[PDB]
Design a protein around this ligand. Structure first.
Ligand SMILES: Cc1cc2nc3c(=O)[nH]c(=O)nc-3n(C[C@H](O)[C@H](O)[C@H](O)COP(=O)(O)OP(=O)(O)OC[C@H]3O[C@@H](n4cnc5c(N)ncnc54)[C@H](O)[C@@H]3O)c2cc1C
Ligand SMILES: [Cl-]
Ligand SMILES: [Cl-]
Length: 491
């Protein structure tokens, strides 16, 4: 004989568009849905926010409910894959192990080791591509052996290849369950823990709930107005909108695979066929999935892509070791309310609009503080619920003019940028309530408010809210000079 399979979740935390799951179930007597949880992961070198970890746990709870509805259940195995799988292969009489391919660096090492162990145990391994739109190694190959290095050339490449594969069918309404009385499948050892049980001491504050069920609901909400979908232009959306965010907020769901990228793409093409004036890449909503695909393709084929040194696409720049500036930025006490409000949204929600990320990343790196993008990436990695190895690295290199982007004379203003969208400061007042009573005329520049106004607002600069840590005009002039010199050194 009979077929006993494992469907191993890592990303791809969904039942829809899951070719790995469909193969695991095919002709199977027993199917073991597995997630491998690392019970000491939170005891490391890298801190992880409860927001992101709890989003994962909610996503696993949703998978558990989906499998239970179909006569099965999710097995959250504790330990390391290379240690756990050899034992459960033999315990469960496994003949096939299926999982979605993952092109991240650690994934490649882990998966090579598991493939070796599967072969020793006589286990067939099936690893379909479905986290990305395309087989990104196929894209590189069709491009002549190297990844495109511009978004425009990347878009031309995928258009020559054609449409991404359609999303796979839904799985059957009933699934083969684990076998009975298998000790490694004992319910008490294989349940989804809570954030308290994994060791977090403060509760999650984010407003976006994990899981495939929420992902599909938010997909449908995005598609309730096909004219908005068709006309979407990313650079024209409003980073100060928080009650109704100006973009889809599907990124955490795409990061964890709660939402299929191929489903999203197929739904876009359906709308586009009915709206021939729809927006085109890069600014379109399909363009956004292509930004993701572009950075996955370059990132996966570039050594040390998430670092500066040893990264062949990355400019070597003489960033300052300035821990005081990094700390003020990380801790949302720069004294620029637009910046501090965005950094507070980072820690509270784990998600900000793309141009809000632009504002704070420019400020930290080539715009004002001249701190390395690697340090900014680490702070984002701790807190983002959509934290994505390749996307975070690529966008930090873009924003610091280290790769892909080189126009270091374009510097966002930490005062003016948000005011053009939100002159009343509704976003600032939401995330920085200490400023909730500051007249709009001063809310982006509270240090300019008369002391009488600061006192009446209950927000005295230097006491209740810090003074700005730099003069933007002075800081940006200095950073631009350093960037120019760094570019000349790389000649
Ligand atoms: C400094 C910095 C760090 C970032 N770190 C991350 C990260 O860790 N994870 C992440 O998913 N995105 C990251 N982004 C990209 C982008 O800001 C987010 O993808 C976007 O804000 C997610 O919101 P949304 O789902 O509403 O996007 P939409 O505009 O609705 O786009 C739909 C989907 O397309 C993808 N996408 C959109 N914009 C980009 C982009 N610029 N690059 C790559 N893919 C994109 C995402 O999967 C997103 O969910 C970063 C950007 C910057 C400037
Ligand atoms: Cl764009
Ligand atoms: Cl600006």
């Amino acid at each position: 004989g009979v077929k006993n399979s494992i469907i191993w979740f890592r990303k791809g935390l969904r039942l829809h568009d899951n070719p790995a799951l469909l193969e695991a179930c095919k002709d199977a007597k027993h199917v073991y849905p597995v997630f491998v949880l690392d019970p000491h992961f939170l005891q490391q070198s890298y801190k992880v926010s409860v927001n992101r970890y709890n989003f994962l746990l909610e996503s696993l709870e949703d998978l558990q409910r989906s499998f239970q509805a179909r006569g099965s259940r999710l097995l959250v195995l504790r330990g390391k894959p290379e240690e756990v799988f050899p034992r459960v292969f033999r315990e469960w009489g496994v003949t096939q192990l299926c999982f979605e391919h993952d092109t991240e660096p650690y994934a490649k090492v882990r998966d090579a080791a598991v493939r070796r162990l599967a072969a020793e145990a006589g286990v067939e391994v099936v690893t379909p591509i479905s986290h990305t739109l395309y087989d990104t190694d196929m894209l590189v190959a069709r491009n002549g052996g190297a990844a495109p290095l511009t978004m425009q050339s990347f878009t031309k490449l995928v258009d020559r290849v054609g449409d991404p594969p359609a999303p796979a069918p839904d799985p059957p309404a009933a699934m083969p369950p684990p076998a009975e009385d298998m000790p490694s499948a004992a319910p008490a050892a294989t349940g989804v823990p809570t954030w308290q049980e994994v060791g977090f001491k403060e509760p999650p504050l984010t407003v976006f709930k994990g899981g495939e069920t929420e992902a599909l609901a938010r997909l449908e909400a995005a598609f309730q107005d096909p004219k908005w979908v068709a006309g979407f232009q990313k650079p024209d959306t409003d980073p100060s909108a928080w009650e109704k965010p100006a973009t889809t907020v599907l990124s955490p769901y795409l990061k964890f695979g709660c939402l299929s990228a191929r489903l999203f793409h197929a739904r876009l093409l359906e709308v586009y066929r009915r709206h021939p004036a729809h927006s085109q890449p890069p600014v379109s909503l399909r363009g956004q999935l292509l930004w993701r695909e572009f950075f996955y393709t370059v990132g996966s084929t570039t050594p040390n892509f998430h670092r500066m040194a040893g990264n062949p696409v990355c400019k070597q720049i003489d960033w300052d070791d300035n821990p005081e500036f990094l700390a003020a930025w990380r801790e949302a006490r720069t004294g620029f309310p637009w910046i501090d409000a965005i950094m507070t949204q980072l820690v509270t929600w784990g998600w900000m609009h793309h141009l809000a990320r632009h504002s704070v990343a420019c400020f930290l790196t080539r715009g004002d503080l001249y701190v390395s993008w690697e340090r900014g990436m680490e702070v984002f990695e701790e807190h983002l619920i959509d934290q994505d190895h390749y996307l975070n690295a690529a966008n930090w290199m873009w924003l610091s003019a280290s790769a892909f982007f080189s126009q270091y004379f374009r510097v966002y203003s930490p005062v003016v940028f948000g005011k053009k969208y939100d002159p009343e400061g509704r976003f600032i007042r939401k995330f920085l309530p200490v400023l909730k009573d500051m007249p709009a005329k001063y809310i982006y520049e509270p240090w300019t408010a008369p002391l009488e106004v600061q006192r009446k607002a209950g927000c005295v600069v230097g006491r209740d809210y810090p003074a700005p840590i730099v003069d933007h005009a002075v800081a940006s002039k200095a950073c631009i000079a350093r960037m120019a010199a760094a570019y000349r050194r790389s000649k």
